[PDB]
Amino acid sequence: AIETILVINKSGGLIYQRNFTNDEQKLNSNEYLILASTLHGVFAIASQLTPKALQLTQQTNIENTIPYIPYVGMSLGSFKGDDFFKEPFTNWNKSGLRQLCTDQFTMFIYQTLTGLKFVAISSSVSTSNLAIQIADNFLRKVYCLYSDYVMKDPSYSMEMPIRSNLFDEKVKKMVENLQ
Amino acid sequence: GYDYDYLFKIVLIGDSGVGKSNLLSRFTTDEFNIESKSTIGVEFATRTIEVENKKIKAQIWDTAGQERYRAITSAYYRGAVGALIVYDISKSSSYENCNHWLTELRENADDNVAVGLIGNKSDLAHLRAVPTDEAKNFAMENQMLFTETSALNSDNVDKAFRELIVAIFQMVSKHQVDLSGAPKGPTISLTPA
Amino acid sequence: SDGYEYTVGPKQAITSEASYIPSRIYSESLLFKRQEASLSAMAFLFQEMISQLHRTCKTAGDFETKLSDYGHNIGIRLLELLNFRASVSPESLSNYITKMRRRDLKILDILQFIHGTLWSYLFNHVSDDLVKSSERDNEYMIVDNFPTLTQFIPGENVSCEYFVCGIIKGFLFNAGFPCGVTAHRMPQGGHSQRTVYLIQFDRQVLDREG
Amino acid sequence: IELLNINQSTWLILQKKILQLCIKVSRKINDFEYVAKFSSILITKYTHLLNQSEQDALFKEYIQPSITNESITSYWDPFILREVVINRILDSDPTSNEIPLESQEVFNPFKVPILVFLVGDKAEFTCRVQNPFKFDFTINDIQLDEEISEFCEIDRKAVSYSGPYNVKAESIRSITLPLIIKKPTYKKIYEISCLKISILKLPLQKFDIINDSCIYGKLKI
Amino acid sequence: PQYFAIIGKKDNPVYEIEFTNAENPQGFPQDLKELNPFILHASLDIVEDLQWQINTDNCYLGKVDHFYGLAITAYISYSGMKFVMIHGNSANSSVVIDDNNMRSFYQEVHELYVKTLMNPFYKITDPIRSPAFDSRVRTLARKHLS
Amino acid sequence: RSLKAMGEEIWKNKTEKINTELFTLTYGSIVAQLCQDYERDFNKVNDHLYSMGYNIGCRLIEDFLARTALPRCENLVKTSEVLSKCAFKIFLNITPNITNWSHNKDTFSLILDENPLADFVELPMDAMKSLWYSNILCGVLKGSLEMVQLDCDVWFVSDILRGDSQTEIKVKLNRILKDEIPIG
Ligand SMILES: *C(=O)CCCCCCCCCCCCCCC
């Protein structure tokens, strides 16, 4: 049950913080900017903490591929068909923060090649490896939806807050399907 | 409270020990996660101001690199549309490092970034070591605004910060227009059989 | 250089000259070459057009007028080769047809034509429920339950949709029916992206038809 | 003329044909008013259609009698004399005649010429008169204004001595004249674009400056 | 000889051309040459009269107007573009128009006009200045007219 | 399948399609009204179309790479292959070829066999030597490649509308700027 989705534009800074919990509203808008910027900084820290053993020898370019789930999304815009993608896809952030485990929630992070960051907080604590695949598939779902309804928007400056009407309701429906 | 139309990223960079932490004591919402400077490298402050009838949120990143932050400090200028170079008029080393800081900003920060110069601890006229004329002349060649700030001389940095945000908003603001007798009654079908 | 040259006037074209200066626009046919492209390219061209139009305009009315002018020319072009091109009955295709399509000259024949073939050609599906408000004198309207070009535009305001309004206006204007075409949003029926193109004819057309 | 849109129809050839017939009949009867009236239209609107022969014959036949008997007292179009640049030149060395000089913060870098003259110095007035038509006409005299006149008006004696200024057929031929300055101005930046001209011995008519395309060429003295 | 013109809604010609028979390469001798635009202007009124009338085809009107041994045929496109031809005898005859040939000629010339109109830079008011258009129109006249 | 059948499958059944005559008519209307606005200064029209294409490409780099999610191109060959074999395929029904490889593998040309933008086009006689009609594509390529930290220069050298038979777009990589976020 993904209870909160937030996205960081390219350089830190928050542009979308719609949450789907029943009623908590504990964190004001101001603190969530600090949370997102801290996440970006911690991502940067995590990039430069690889162990010495793996820096000179990776030999692991077979596990980066994400297996695809059939219908994780729902049950479209520029896309067409029963789903946004049927094929398996590859990981981009092979040297960055990927999730955060906690006994009360689990945070997943999916970084676009360009730099867009999509963060999903789920109340559910899966073998702690399949859930990565579920989260990556769902977040690429959300990224495709964003590329549809936020990028093809004349009244939207780049890397600024996403004040739109179709995008938020469609991601709300998408997360409602996934539970 | 997601009402702000624009989110500008500003970096408060300067020499260690200059007194940046006291410099951003005013333009803040003094709450939220305090410290965290030594943990990741930055502390965060925010300001809200209206310009041309449009709410603007400005996020201030007061980065500093002591011994550990080589690549991360560079990465923290990924999209900063503003900079607030700081030096103290007590020791010439801080003013000398301004060219090095500006070189890093213009090399790594966002293209055509609006960057300014702040002279902190100007109340202490006893140990002055950098004149206003030289600082202004250095600002002229590099397209920067320049000011001097002090605890007794407060409320100047606030005006300079608002003026910097206004300068930014006149550069990264796409022009827009305020987009804001329909038929009524029972219709009758007219589609062909 | 013997092309009309209207200042001089008509020229003597002796009927013994077959010398042919290929043009690359007259030789090419226009039959119906299917080259369907992605909706994404159309959407991005559309939104960049509107973005460029924001800086040039000053008010909402000027924005709508300039967008309608943009679509007007597309209407000018589309009228001819949607009326003409439908006359083909299953090199030049002029000598493939025995009978030109009967050009419409009535109040509702053109609106049926737009409902049927123009909208299908534009958006690959016939438009929905062409109706008229039969109260005042004349309020004819074309309603689409889910417009294609402006589906990505957020908000409840209809200002970016005047492009197809201009297309329709140019179509009827060349066809011999001046109009006051304008769009409105009428969310009804569970779609809620429902747009109605109210069409208002001039007194001249009303006098001509009766 | 009412049937067409001489003053719904944009067939220029037919319009000029009927207008030619109108002037021909208007001369057939002794009606010297409408000959001028319609020749004014025929060499203001349909000027880019009558070639050398038609314009030359029409100017010889219907225009010059229409001027000698004072039937029309205004020039055809206002699109004459595109540039009116004025200059002064230092006769002696540059040192000779100088124009007198006329006796904590927050810095940010984020935010046509005017001519000056003395009483005694001599100036140079140059204007680029144009002749869009295929015939030749002659300018008789040139004057500046009523307001900025009495200050720096062109020497009447000089233009009178120089005689009429003939303009070639399709030229932008220029006229260079002297100029005399008599009165001061203290501190009042006046403007100069009135520039009365007489063409083919007509009343002095105003002509405002028009550049290459509608923008006005204005200068201050 | 033949005199052909394409006229827009504002009653202005966007194209004009005259054809001959190649044994008398002079066109209309001197007087009908001056009178052609006026008679075509007159016939445009009848063409506009037939533009909105019920009673098959309605784009090709055939012989609509008559003058001193001159047959006048009109064809109307979908954008109100009027295609008008004036047929003249060979200095003595009663001119009879070939229905199928004139129909096909107007069809192909309408093809030319529509594919001229399609390009971005053309405007309805502007005239059809193009050597290719004139060349293909005149070889078309050879093909279909006579 | 490397890239051919991949892009073929995506265009076959992944994307909602629209008629291209509408696309070329729209682009023609923009270009014509732009030339009217700018008073026949076709160099400025080229600059404006370049800016428009740059904005479009900066926005477009998400649509591609969200539908495809191909890995980062390594060096100057996979990028050309993808860009000419599926990037154009997904958005348009065209599969341009690669030609004129430079001696040191730094420049390549996109021979555009079909140009849907210039479908019904015939330039005015006073612009056959100045106006690059489909200048939006160069801006799109420039911005789109810059957004993946692959800054380069893109320009026309010949067009079918102007003179020579073949139309080609030369793409020359200046440098791979290393501001490409903490990955890899
Ligand atoms: C390797 O670095 C990946 C390269 C990504 C190539 C992206 C190219 C997308 C744009 C293609 C042109 C489409 C034209 C659309 C016209 C509106």
CA distance C15 to E2: 11
Q: Are E17 and C59 in contact (CB under 8 A)?
A: no
Closest by Cα among D9, C158, C60, C136 to E41: D9
Cα–Cα distances (Å) from C45 to A154, C50, C149, F49, F131, in that order, read 10, 9, 10, 11, 20
Other Cβ atoms less than 10 A from the Cβ of D131: the count is 17
Cα(F159)–Cα(B168) distance, rounded to whole angstroms? 41
Structure tokens at D208: 């405002």
In the sheet with D174-179, reading across from the earlier edge strand, the strands are: D86-88, D123-128, D174-179
Q: Which residues line ligand 1 (CB under 6 A)?
A: C 41, 44-45; F 56, 60, 64, 72-73, 79, 82-83, 87-88, 91, 140, 144, 148, 150
Residue (of E78, E84, E72) closest to E14 by Cα position: E84
Residue C6 lies in a domain: no
In this structure, the number of other CB atoms found within 10 A of the CB of residue A123 comes to: 12
Residue D48 to residue F170: CA distance in whole angstroms: 45
Neighbours of A38 (CB within 10 A): 17
Measured between beta carbons, the chain A residues lying within 8 angstroms of B168 are none
Q: Which two tokens stand for residue D22?
A: 């109108």
Strand, coil or helix: what is F110? strand
Q: What is the dihedral of CA E72, E78, E79, E84, to 10 degrees?
A: -10
Tell me if A20 sits within 8 A of A127, measured CB to CB. Answer: no
Q: Are C121 and E77 in contact (CB under 8 A)?
A: no
The boundaries of the domain holding residue E39 are 1-146
Displacement of CA C6 from its chain's centroid (Å): 30
- Does residue B95 contact residue B87 with C-beta atoms inside 8 Å? yes
Cross-strand partners of B61: B11, B44
Nearest CA in chain D to E42: D14
Q: Whose CA is nearest to atom 1 of ligand 1?
A: F73
CA neighbor of C87 nearest in space, from C74, C77, C96: C96
Count of A-F CB contacts under 8 Å: 73
CA distance A45 to B75: 10
Tokens of B82: 């503003």
CA of A23, closest CA in chain F: separation in Å?
33
B1 is in an annotated binding site: no
CA B29, chain centre distance (Å): 15
DSSP string, chain B: -TT-SEEEEEE--B-TTS-HHHHTTSSS---SS---HHHHS--EEEEEEESSS-EEEEEEE----SSS-SHHHHHTTSS-SEEEEEEETT-HHHHHHHHHHHHHHHHHS-TT-EEEEEEE--S--TT--S-HHHHHHHHHHTT-EEEE--STTTTHHHHHHHHHHHHHHTTS------------S--EE----
In this complex, is the C-beta atom of C146 within 8 Å of any C-beta atom belonging to chain A? no
Select the residue from B30, B38, B59 to test the A interface by mutation, using most A Cβ atoms within 10 A: B59
Buried b (16+ CB within 10 A) or exposed e, B37-67: eeebbbbbbbbebebeeeebbbbbbbbbeee
Question: Parallel, antiparallel, or unpaired: how do β-strands E13-19 and C12-13 relate?
Answer: parallel
DSSP state of C116: I
Q: Which of C169, C201, C196 is nearest to C184 (CA)?
A: C196
Rounded to whole angstroms, the Cα distance separating E20 from C113 reads 41
Handedness of CA F96, F101, F102, F104 (dihedral sign): positive
Nearest CA distance, A62 vs chain F (angstrom): 13
The 3-class secondary structure across E37-64, one letter per residue, is HHHHHHHHHHHHHHHCCCCCCCCEEEEE
Written as one letter, the residue type at B61 is W
| Nearest-10 Cα torsion for D103, D107, D112, D117 | 10
Give the integer Cα–Cα distance in Å for A120 and C30: 52
| Contact B193/C at CB under 8 A | no
Does the residue C129 lie in any domain?
yes
Of E63, E56, E67, E100, which Cα lies nearest the Cα of E84? E63
Does A81 map to a domain?
Answer: no
Query: Would you tell me how many other CB atoms lie within 10 Å of the CB of residue B152?
Result: 6
CATH of the domain spanning F1-184, picked from 1.10.8.50, 3.40.190.10, 3.30.1380.20, 3.40.50.10860: 3.30.1380.20
Q: Is A67 exposed, middle or buried (0-12, 13-18, 19+ CB in 10 A)?
A: exposed
Tokens of D149: 């006149």
Q: What's the structural domain count of chain C?
A: 1
Q: What is the CATH number of the domain that holds C191?
A: 3.30.1380.20
Supply the range of the domain harboring residue A30. Answer: 1-49+91-179
Strand residue runs (E) in chain C: 12-13, 37-38, 128-132, 140-144, 182-185, 195-199
- Number of other CB atoms surrounding residue A62 within 10 Å: 6
Domain count for chain A, please give it. Answer: 1
Q: How far is CA B40 from CA A102, B25, B43, B62, in A?
A: 21, 20, 9, 11
A155: which chain C residues are within 8 Å (Cβ-Cβ)? 54, 153-155
- For the CA of F64, the closest atom of ligand 1 is 9
Cα gap A139→A111, rounded to integer Å: 9
Distance from CA of C7 to the nearest CA of D (A): 6
Q: Determine the longest span between alpha carbons in chain F, in angstroms.
A: 53
* Domain boundary assignment for chain F: 1-184
Which residues in chain D have Cβ-Cβ distances shorter than 8 Å to C9?
13
* Atom number of ligand 1 nearest to Cα C45: 17
| Residue D24 backbone class (left: φ over 0; alpha: ψ -120 to 50; beta: rest) | alpha
Question: Which residues does A166 contact at the CB level (< 8 Å), separation at least 6?
Answer: A149, C152, C154
Q: Residue F56's Cα: distance from chain center in Å?
A: 11
Per the structure, the complete domain to which residue C70 belongs is given by 35-210
Report the helix count and the strand count for chain F, using DSSP H and E.
Answer: 6, 5
Q: Is C13 within the bounds of a domain?
A: no
Q: How far is the CA of F171 from the centre of ligand 1 (A)?
A: 12
Token pair recorded at residue C97: 């047809």
User: Exposed, middle or buried, F17 (CB in 10 Å: 0-12/13-18/19+)?
Assistant: middle
Closest partner CB to F63 (pick from A85, A116, A151): A151
B159/D contact by beta carbon, under 8 A: yes
- Answer whether C102's CB lies under 8 Å from C195's CB: no
Residue A72 corresponds to which amino acid? Answer: V
Name residues whose C-beta falls within 8 Å of residue C159's C-beta, 6 or more positions apart in sequence. Answer: B179, C60, C63, C64, C67
> In chain C, which residues touch F (CB < 8 A)?
23-25, 30, 35-42, 44-49, 51-52, 56, 69-71, 73-74, 77-78, 121-124, 148
Residue B123 labelled as part of a binding site: yes
Q: What are phi and psi of A5, to 5 degrees?
A: -130, 130
